[PDB]
Symmetry: C3
Subunit: 345 residues, 3 copies
């Protein structure tokens, strides 16, 4: 009861504790907000999952979250936004994905020097983007992280002496796909892996832990994450993706985020909105294939550009349907509360 | 008399017929609206020209138009916009150009599965873009088609197993141009071919049929299309393009669209506006060369990005000249009526 | 006294002289406005520095400035903006950098044909961009020049028969950096060279002359230019750039412009704003590395994209700090006057 939703009672009870405890809560909420979850217990569970995946990635992501939150505080950003973790998840992703795409080994402590720096740009970028997107009542989903990490990975590249990144290359030959070597266990495993890849994690246990963290806050978010992962796998099979690429969940995490966002988070959860979420996730999968192919030419990973663009497109979509209701950004908490608010409206 | 303009009398007489006839009219108007023509007879003539070029391309383009119109209806878009074909031409182009840039043979029926899908995204995109561009009173020229087809051709690419696209590669050597092998007949033929390449068609007869379709609705549109084709050829000669590339009309169709749009369609046709149309077409030709070179690196055709960007730039241009008059978007029908409205104003 | 600032007394005394003298003043002010200086004496000193660097580049840049100013006059742009040189510096940069990146020899007079043309697009672009950026009270820093020159250099490319550009290629191997061959004299020389590279000039004397021109108008602008150059060099050393690349000042000029803009020009000069300028210059250096690496894939020089993007981001940044004050665009003259205005406010 006190653990589900966004833990409003815990927020009230902590708004008068020590500043260190409040900062820890903001960091946990920022960790959870990567998947639109404003829950500190979910953030703790996600931290446990990341520790299961890679403790070094956990260190880099936690440092990114801390630095992003501290920079948002120093820049005088909205304290309500900071307290809900809306200024820590972009830095979390920045740290995690500069650890993931580093050609150096684990515990390359020098990588903390760039991480911090490009975690400091995440609040700035957010602010700048909020100067534009607020004029359309749009969120800045992961555009700060995407901009920052794309710029970092292009600036360093694979041949940097200090911070070399992993080699990303375009596809140059037709894959050999024989449909009799499909492994149903691996295809099923790609659903939790697809969920976990929103944090850059390929461990199936990490993805299952992330699903548990999603369910703790909002069961509808967990359901839409699983459905988005499945939609991503189906799209990958539809355009004849090699099975090895499908198994890694790199075709699903953008669709996971898109299905979470459109299906109940920023639209009111109705069956029309659920169908819109499915269509947005499919279009996001194909746009992710396109963006990955385009950005592999300059040697940069696709990130979550496709999720941001597809979700922005489907939020800017205007229909005369009363059942497709876009909630005001200030009223958006989580799909159950969003549906209740929509019913009252 | 009843066949010229936008056939307002026919629209009035059909607004009370069967829904199937109205849908056929909307599809024909969407076919014609690729070249800013809101005329069903012009759409029928364009369909005849496409049948002359390639019946398979006709099938794919017609399916794209039908799917785009049906998706716009299902999404509750403005019925006035749907009835004028403003939600069918982007899907028409999507179907036509995914047929054109398919490495498979003609009548590869499986290509209808992707076509439909990315024809369904054309209304959505339009809506999303209209949420922004309406704040500047701008049209969404072919940005839905350009976004959708660029994403599709990047997602599949040349090495896709199911839907391989044609190989697009950057230029890697200096062309050998000897100016004594210029063929004046082929240079002249490149004018109707340049007009026809707005639909992806390289048949000169198809381009002539398209010019007839333009003339049926508005002689000024036909004149500006021919002048834009000539301007594109002159620009191609100006930057020393190989004659083989010039003959294909790939340097002219963007300029055709830009000259139509700026010269009388969205500006009031005056001599100052005609000069502005010429300058916009020239800048569009050079921007098209730039965009084609840039996008060949990722293996994607240039599309009509240059026309959209150049026309948006020249519409956003603000001058103190009273003779350069930008008509309100709701008053834009065709250059003759636009000039009459401007004279009354 | 009459030579510092923006020479308001000279502007008043010249507003009633011959039109040729006024046009010469506008051209000189446009030359100076590349570095945010609205001073004709500074423009003359910059012209002297360019003559020191390369008289052919001086010819191309002067022609670009003249053509841009004349096109702005013909298009009926704001006479106050034209008289302050705000419509001549983009054309100046266009001419200078199409001369710099030309694979032909000096005094290739045919290069004046493209220069003029893409100097005519600089006002248009500015106008178009001002239709958007004015809605956020933002300047169009060098986006007209960046768009125009990127399009030109992509359209022609290295293999053009008439106007071949220099070969720009991505890095394909790890540099061999031995830190014992650092030359302190060359590292120090890279500061004035970094300042001079805003005009594409690598002569250290040209950069020193540019610093003198900056100091004549505003000592704070000169100080921030030097500090931005130093910040660019420090960033280049931070990401292990080969010393040969560092010595050319190609890592500093974007940071020079960013430090000038944020540190006193469009923000009120306080110590908080000076720190913000340092951070913006650092982020601009890294974004410049990223953009250069990305655009070398399509064979295009980075230009000043990074400066424009970083400065726009840091201007759109919203803080609750009263000491970080964004001046209204109409009140922006130069850092000393800006600080006085901020103190009165």
């Amino acid at each position: 009861g006190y653990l589900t939703g966004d833990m409003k009672e815990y927020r009230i009870w902590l708004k008068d504790k020590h500043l260190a405890l409040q900062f820890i809560d903001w960091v946990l909420r920022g960790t959870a907000q990567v998947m639109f979850i404003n829950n500190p217990l979910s953030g703790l569970i996600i931290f446990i999952g990341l520790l299961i995946q890679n403790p070094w990635w956990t260190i880099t992501g936690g440092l990114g979250t801390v630095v992003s939150t501290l920079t948002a505080l120093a820049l005088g950003q909205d304290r309500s936004a900071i307290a809900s973790g809306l200024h820590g998840y972009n830095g979390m992703l920045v740290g995690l994905l500069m650890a993931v795409f580093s050609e150096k080994l684990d515990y390359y402590w020098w990588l903390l020097f760039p991480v911090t720096f490009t975690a400091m740009s995440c609040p700035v970028l957010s602010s700048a983007l909020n100067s534009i997107f607020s004029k359309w009542d749009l969120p800045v989903f992961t555009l700060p992280f995407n901009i920052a990490v794309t710029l970092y990975l292009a600036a360093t590249g694979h041949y940097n002496l200090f911070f070399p990144t992993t080699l990303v290359e375009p596809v140059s030959s037709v894959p050999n796909i024989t449909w009799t070597e499909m492994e149903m266990p691996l295809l099923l495993q790609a659903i939790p892996v697809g969920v976990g890849q929103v944090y850059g994690c390929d461990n199936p246990w990490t993805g299952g832990v992330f699903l548990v963290a999603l369910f703790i806050s909002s069961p509808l978010i967990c359901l839409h994450a699983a459905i988005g992962s499945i939609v991503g796998l189906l799209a990958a099979l539809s355009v004849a993706t090699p099975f090895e690429t499908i198994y890694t969940g790199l075709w699903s995490y953008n669709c996971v985020l898109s299905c979470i966002a459109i299906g109940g988070m920023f639209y009111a959860l109705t069956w029309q909105t659920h169908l819109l979420a499915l269509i947005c996730a499919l279009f996001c999968a194909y746009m992710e294939a396109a963006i990955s192919n385009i950005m592999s030419v300059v040697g940069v990973p696709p990130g979550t550009w496709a999720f941001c663009l597809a979700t922005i497109i489907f939020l800017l979509l205007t229909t005369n349907n009363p059942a497709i209701f876009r909630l005001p950004l200030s009223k958006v908490t989580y799909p159950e509360a969003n549906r209740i608010y929509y019913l009252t409206v």
